[PDB]
Amino acid sequence: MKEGIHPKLVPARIICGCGNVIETYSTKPEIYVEVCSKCHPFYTGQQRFVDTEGRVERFQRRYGDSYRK
């Protein structure tokens, strides 16, 4: 590598909100992150968050079969 022009990569530890910790190399010694692979909804199982809905509609409507027979 060329002297003088590159930034040093040093041992570094990246920390996520989910308490995840990543041992890697960076220009910065310590870095704090909002999300990571370990806790990201798409990555973790299928952690479908708020939306179980699919979607619901339309005739989950029901409520009911009250109109007479």
């Binding site: 590159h6 190399y25 692979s37 990555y43």
Partner: protein, 181 residues
């Protein structure tokens, strides 16, 4: 060389699985990473702010490697482009620095992507290489909102020894590339 989590994972976890999936007879037949090439298409810096060392330095922060410039191959009237104008930054990552960059990319960068729901299964070379495009550079851990003048995106080329799409996909998948389908 040094120990990086993703590199070790390739040798002890990914390599045996690939032999299992595809049954290579030679230890070299099995897929490898050759290099990763990053490109900031830019040209927003063609005339205005005729030099953006900012994009270079910030790209230098992410990769640990100072990018080299790319200049226009020909003049183009419509793009307001004169031949030889500085209109891009490209950096070629090999060996350890490739692993380290791919490692953070898979672990933190891609998850930071807005409304991210996996990569594109169709973006494969046909010849067993892959490309993906980013629109924001703040997606990387060592780049923050405070340090940025404007959003710059990039193009990423991951180049493998695999002959085919099928082999390269298994490699990138086994390594931890999250695909939408």
């Amino acid at each position: 060389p040094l120990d990086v989590a993703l590199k070790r994972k390739y040798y002890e976890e990914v390599r045996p699985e690939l032999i299992r999936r595809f049954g290579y007879q030679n230890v070299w037949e099995v897929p490898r990473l050759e290099k990763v090439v990053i490109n900031q298409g830019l040209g927003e810096a063609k005339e205005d702010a005729r030099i953006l060392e900012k994009a270079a330095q910030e790209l230098a922060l992410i990769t640990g490697q100072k990018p080299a410039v790319t200049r226009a191959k020909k003049s183009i009237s419509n793009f307001k482009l004169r031949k030889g104008m500085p209109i891009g930054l490209r950096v070629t990552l090999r060996r350890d620095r490739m692993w380290i960059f791919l490692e953070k990319l898979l672990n933190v960068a891609l998850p930071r992507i807005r409304d991210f729901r996996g990569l594109n299964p169709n973006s494969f070379d046909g010849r067993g290489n892959y490309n993906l495009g980013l629109r924001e550079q703040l997606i990387f851990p060592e780049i923050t909102y405070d340090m940025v003048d404007a959003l710059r995106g990039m193009d990423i080329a991951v180049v493998t020894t695999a002959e085919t799409d099928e082999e390269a996909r298994a490699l990138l998948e086994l390594l931890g590339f999250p695909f939408r389908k």
